[PDB]
Amino acid sequence: VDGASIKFDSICLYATFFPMAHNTASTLEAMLRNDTNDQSFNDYLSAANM
């Protein structure tokens, strides 16, 4: 009720790639695809809210 307003003119997504030695990156990519080396994550406020 105070006339505050905001518009998005444009938006872009940025990313940063670590320049890895191609053979090392290739072997890492090979290893990371097997089931035994799957990545896992959890969350700090592991929780639930109510």
Partner: protein, 271 residues
């Protein structure tokens, strides 16, 4: 790390002491292990139960990735592709298998991992065994060369056998043909390349007539330096009496053989 593509693979798709080797886990969980018994009896409950639950009913696994990675690694260690190409071709083969899969395909894949393991081992031992390709090239060149020398023949064929023995007995030596000539490199990325065709052409005229003329350095300039290197490389071979002595060629061979000899001997002595 390890050349055996099975071993150099299985480091990548595997846990550590999981229920892939069921017998060891079952031995350790009851009491059977003697190295450190009662280890499992005193872990937290969850862990204990979970192993036990894993042990009584094993969980099936999908070994497609393991086999495909094994064959890819075999290709990489055998110079079939570059390592970047290895990273790409792993996914390529994975898609290929996944879009045509069948029990027959898995059977052929196991056959193939066995075959590539054997292939890598064979390639390594053959590369350390003498490089038959050089022998084939040398035999082709010798077929190109004539086998008859009007002045002297025993020395010529003795020298030919000596050269054959030299190329056979030292692996990593290269014999090939680049232009309209055959050559002999004592090592990959190595100096001392001998123009074999030119050396034989020059040496054809010195076989059976340089024995009486060895005392006077009147024809000594006929020996082109390339052929001199060729003779120098065969000093350890063609031991005394193989080439008839009192011959300019024989004299050079004997001198070179004596020189190299004092050297290696003194060297293993060192200190």
């Amino acid at each position: 790390t390890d050349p055996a593509v099975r071993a150099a693979l299985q480091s990548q798709p595997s846990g550590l002491n999981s229920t892939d080797d069921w017998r060891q886990v079952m031995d350790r969980i009851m009491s059977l292990t003697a190295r450190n018994p009662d280890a499992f009896r005193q872990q937290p409950q969850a862990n204990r139960l979970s192993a036990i639950l894993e042990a009584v009913v094993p969980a099936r696994a999908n070994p497609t990735h393991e086999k495909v990675l094994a064959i890819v690694n075999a290709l990489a260690e055998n110079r079939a592709i570059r390592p970047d190409e290895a990273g790409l071709v792993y996914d390529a083969l994975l898609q290929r298998v996944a879009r045509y899969n069948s029990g027959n395909v898995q059977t052929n894949l196991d056959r193939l991992v066995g075959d590539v393991r054997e292939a890598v081992a064979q390639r390594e031992r053959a590369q350390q065994q003498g490089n038959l390709g050089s022998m084939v090239a040398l035999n082709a060149f010798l077929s190109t060369q004539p086998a008859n020398v009007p002045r002297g023949q025993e020395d010529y064929t003795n020298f030919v056998s000596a050269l054959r023995l030299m190329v056979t007995e030292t692996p990593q030596s290269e014999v090939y043909q680049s232009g309209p000539d055959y050559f002999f490199q004592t090592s990959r990325q190595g100096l001392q390349t001998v123009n074999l065709s030119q050396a034989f052409k020059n040496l054809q005229g010195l076989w059976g007539v340089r024995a009486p003329t060895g005392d006077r350095a009147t024809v000594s300039s006929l020996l082109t330096p390339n052929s001199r290197l060729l003779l120098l490389l065969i000093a350890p071979f063609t031991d005394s009496g193989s080439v008839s002595r009192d011959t300019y060629l024989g004299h050079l061979l004997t001198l070179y053989r004596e020189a190299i000899g004092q050297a290696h001997v003194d060297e293993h002595t060192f200190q």
